[PDB]
């Protein structure tokens, strides 16, 4: 979904925004423009306030009098905007006129009037937007007025920073913006003293926010360095953010009060107000706050430190003030002055400190101020209660409202995002959500107002106004997710199967119709969690909690697959499982089991709300005992029927049932089964729980899976734990590999294969595919019984070789000389005459022990001594040659295994060369 | 158009005219000529009746017997003309033959016969035309005859005035013009008695008009003074106009009746018949007249008084007689005689009065007359109903006819004009039109006959015959005009879009096809009378009354510019306005608004009949609020948009709309704005509803329109009603004129100029362009603050002149002596030694008060006393010199302002001379 927005109709600029309580029309102040928009943010009307030829330096602007200074077309910035409902108009105060104010008709934006002539008609030279604020207060005729604060820019004589002014009925009337009570001695206005300007050149009061409360008017302000920070002479300017207040009723301006305000977080100071918003707590916050319904609260935003009002720091904190607490601080302060203690202490106003005069008085909240101990400041800075702090992205603006008693706070960010915060000090928690309706790259402005209906929140940017909906629970699809988010507005409208606020849910008041906590969802359980595929139409009981009255009717849907009607009794729902015809359509190809999300479909809504893990487990498919029992599910194996089933009764008879894996029928392993090719040999086997074949059932067979040939040999089952294939010989064609492992399957009654967990195999080995030489065979294990047969020039078992002579040769225990040693090749071909070389000789059929080879090696005449570690038996000899000084030059290498017998000696093919 | 006419073919003369009922051929009697013409007045045939050698004195003319008296070629005047259809000929009775009659064949004018031989064949010596008349009455054979009356000229033995004569079939036959029944005792003729001739020498009966009615024959006659006026002996002759009647059936001539006739108007007597015409009334006149369809009426024309039959008076009146009324008068008279009361009373006929004899009789209308109480006269003159009277131009002739029941009367005038009169006593109204088809200079004759078809009316003049069309409605272009004229013949043929009679309009009988009254036109209205230029294709509803069925189809045409189709529903027409593309093409350059005549174009005719005022008003063009609202049209101004538009919605927003002129934005005046050149001064202004500049809008500036230099100074708008340009100095180059008013324009947001109704200006004044002298400056207003600066010898404000010394001089309140008086010139240069002279001295820098100058003036030593009234301060002194007897002769004039101080005195350039 996209958020409805109004792009800077003048793509060029934007400054202030306000909403009409009745209409919902949105008025937007901007530079050179003032717009009237619909609730939807469609452009209703555009007013051209802009570019006027003018010059800031000139006093009474060009229209009244001629100015020596040159003029230029300049932009007129909307400094302020205030809705005057009674007058049915809009006060849209600009600048660049010496700050002349304009009156636009409410409906059409028709300019009712814009008083320029008198001095009062000029507010301030100041070009900056938002540095001004104020409130319009009205009563029936003969009671009324406008309170406005603005920066001076060092214009102290020309304009008052704070004033109480008149708003006549007729826009044409000359009287406008005149001071409520003007006397030669005192006027309902406060000017900045010239002395204070000389001392600190730049001093100026910037008014951020302002609101009327009870019967007073408050302003959040920023001021300069005056005794803060201390400094003998001018240099750097830092600001102090303070609260100001006035009685509506005080024409005299005696009521003025000014307290510094801020808050600290773990030793970090937040002194500068970015924005504020007066609001109500609602039942939730108020209770724990300890307030009356009527009592007000002030949300604020402050940046860290005293530095750079023009461009503040990212570090920012949202604090809170209860008006009762501030009222107390003020009353406390006044009751003190009346004590006669200390001075008034207001630096910018009164350079010379005047003392407070003691007097008898009943100090109340009603106290409007008196002639003596006149305008006064404040010593103790009022601290606020911190709420949320953003380090990375500075908060710019804030708003708040009461929703179902929970207090939702809105906070603009430098990024163009809005945070939706439930304040739960009085409750318990933090920030619920963040949104970027606005503008992804760059920030939001202080004027952020909720609509009259409070459906949306218009968020203003330099560039655009964006209608950000407050609560937007609809985004949440399921009860689990809805309640999961936690943003307090959202609840699960059970019957509607949607997520929204209490007000939005029809009949939410009724029981279990609306769910606040996850527990209410919905939690569901089914008593028969697991049902077998074979079973049909089984009775199931459903336990559900935190659900509304279902009397409308409910259906059980296992999945999109099926749906069965249910009847309700007690606090349970009774439905039936699907038919066998229906159940397997699902189960097929899922195999072992299929977990399915059984849902409940409500009759009224027609949407599945609640779910549970439901298992369909089909035992019958299992072909063997191991899969049946040993598997993950509850299945029973029937030894006799040789079928796997859920029901015990289905088995042939009681003795036949297999509950445990140990009890199955399986083949136990023994020492490796060695099988020579072409030899008749029996193969004994061990195993457990071998079944006695029943009537109509045949006996046991051994099946060998050899690709070349598969052998079927019948066997005898001696007892429950032993088997034996009958005398037979096996072979494979190829002579490719010596040792071939083969899978064997033991079967009975033709097809029934007994389980083989170990997966024992039979090793068919053929006597030397690998060994052409007598030395290699005798080298091999004595277990094989494989031995060298002289006549054939080959090596096989005695069984395999005919005995013309009494003997075939087997290494009796290594006491068997062999024979025919050969030298393939040797390393270092050449060597020095001096000797010392390490010759590495590699041969095929050498001696088995080192001791015999030692003294055996010779290079020609030269004696060579072999190395023990280096020597790998019958494969390789590493030997070190001795002194070569002899006459030969080149000579062949000789190895005599034990003795240099004629059969026993080997000579190198190529000779070793000495150089 | 010109009227078809026949010029006196004999250019020489003209006398009588008649139309053939079947053919339409027109026969025209004239002197020496008888013409046959076509309906068109083309010459068909000309007959020569003329110049015959003859002599009036001779009895049986030369042909029959020899005459002693000398003959001369004389003209033969056509006395009478009568169409004999049965005989297929024309009786054209002439004169100069002793009145022999001629018979011309109908078609060719071939002379069938002209009986001369017998005495009867001679009608009368009388040369005058028109003094004769008569009727031809015919029946099948063995029933028939001709009745003719003529003047005698004192020929009583020769000819009968009235006779009943025979008209035989054969023109050759001798029998012609023989009396119907001739007896030795009584013949069907009436002669004038010799006795009556001796008594009154000249007595003669002139017969003007004659007609047959029912079964009688009537004649309108003129006679002489016989008992009227009373007179012992002959002297003057006056005439009495009377009516005569006879039964057609009375061979005996017993039926003769004679009533005097006339009519009076407000005590004015109209006794002399000019002409008459028997006719029908038609339904309209008859009804109110109270007559049967068959009943006849007699229109007549009479001149005022009894005098000069030969040349009557201009005063003439058209009267009326209903035949029923005259018949009643006759029956009434007869029933009376039968009573035996009184005498017969017929002066000319019976000199000796014979009494009426009583007798039992049923007196009916049928009564033909009896042997006793034989021809009789009448006592009571029958009065007629007056209709129209012309004082200025005498009526000569008359005709009338029935048209669509309305009775139209035609009246010739002495001028040669015809009047078309609808007689509406029985209806209600008067004279509709007058025409000069005829002959512009001089008159029309009694023979005026309508054509058979009654399309035209042949109007005869001495010189020419003119075919004057009766009804000529075609002249009228629009329904409004057509119905406007009122001449009853005309109606608006809606679909044809023409003006004509009912008979002429095809399908006029159908509903709303023909319009009689203006209301029927057409009256049109459009509901959206005013439509804005900005609007397009607006629905308009059209309300029209008195229109025929439009189902043929109608189009809306705003003007010649565009035309849009329309659909009809109910009694309304729905059309659409033009498109914006179309509408402004019109609007451009007309500005404020353009009224356009939206017409309706009928599908059948294709002519625009009906119209309405349609306004196109484009608001947008208005540049300023004043023009927009303050103007003449409904336009709204949008303060914020600063645009003018018809639609309220288009304005920026509700508060922005300007409906009323007061609400605009305008600059109010203050005391005159005085601005010195080269001085830094602010200029405060007052105004109303100054706008607050909205977004994207700049502030206020003051622009001075000075031709030399235009200054742009920015200003501040304090509130909706006050402004002020900032401290600056202004100047203009030239030093030509002291006070220069300058137009100033206040602008905001660069171009927007605020309205200046008063058109207030700034007066730039420079300290004495006008005043070189100290006296002149101090004289000027204290307001200017302008004063005289001694060191410079010039005059300017203190600001303007450097103070080495503590003072620059200003008249503190006139207590400031100045200085350096000078005398330019004085009048009377010379004077008498005795004195008394009034010296008129004219100078530049004199005293401000009279009191100081008095006693100041001296001519040399001689004391001179000044005159108060005569004295114009510091410009001129009028002074009267005292006695000069001193020795000097000539001396210089001196004026000492208050005191004769050395700085303070002035002496004349030229001296005053005493002689």
Swiss-Prot record, chains A, B:
Tissue distribution of the protein: Expressed in the developing nervous system. Widely expressed in both the central and peripheral nervous systems. Expressed in the peripheral ganglia, somatosensory, olfactory, visual, auditory and equilibrium systems.
Record-annotated disulphide pairs: 58-67, 93-101, 247-368, 263-319, 337-356, 473-490, 479-521, 482-499, 493-505, 556-575
All ranges on the Extracellular side of the membrane: 1-915
Gene Ontology terms: cellular component: cerebellar climbing fiber to Purkinje cell synapse; plasma membrane
Keywords: Acetylation, Cell membrane, Disulfide bond, Glycoprotein, Membrane, Receptor, Repeat, Signal, Transmembrane, Transmembrane helix
GO biological-process terms attached to the record: anterior commissure morphogenesis; axon guidance; branchiomotor neuron axon guidance; chemorepulsion of branchiomotor axon; cranial nerve morphogenesis; embryonic heart tube development; facial nerve morphogenesis; facial nerve structural organization
Annotated IPT/TIG domain residues: 821-915
Sample GO molecular function, one term: semaphorin receptor activity
Domain spans labelled Sema: 1-470
Disruption-associated phenotype: No visible phenotype. Mice exhibit defasciculation of the facial branchiomotor nerve and of the ophthalmic branch of the trigeminus, with variable severity. In mice lacking both Plxna3 and Plxna4, migrating neurons do not show the normal response to Sema3A and Sema3F and do not migrate away from these semaphorins (in vitro).
Role noted for this protein: Coreceptor for SEMA3A. Necessary for signaling by class 3 semaphorins and subsequent remodeling of the cytoskeleton. Plays a role in axon guidance in the developing nervous system. Class 3 semaphorins bind to a complex composed of a neuropilin and a plexin. The plexin modulates the affinity of the complex for specific semaphorins, and its cytoplasmic domain is required for the activation of down-stream signaling events in the cytoplasm.
Family note: Belongs to the plexin family.
Subunit structure: Interacts with NRP1 and NRP2.
This protein's name: Plexin-A4
UniProt organism field: Mus musculus
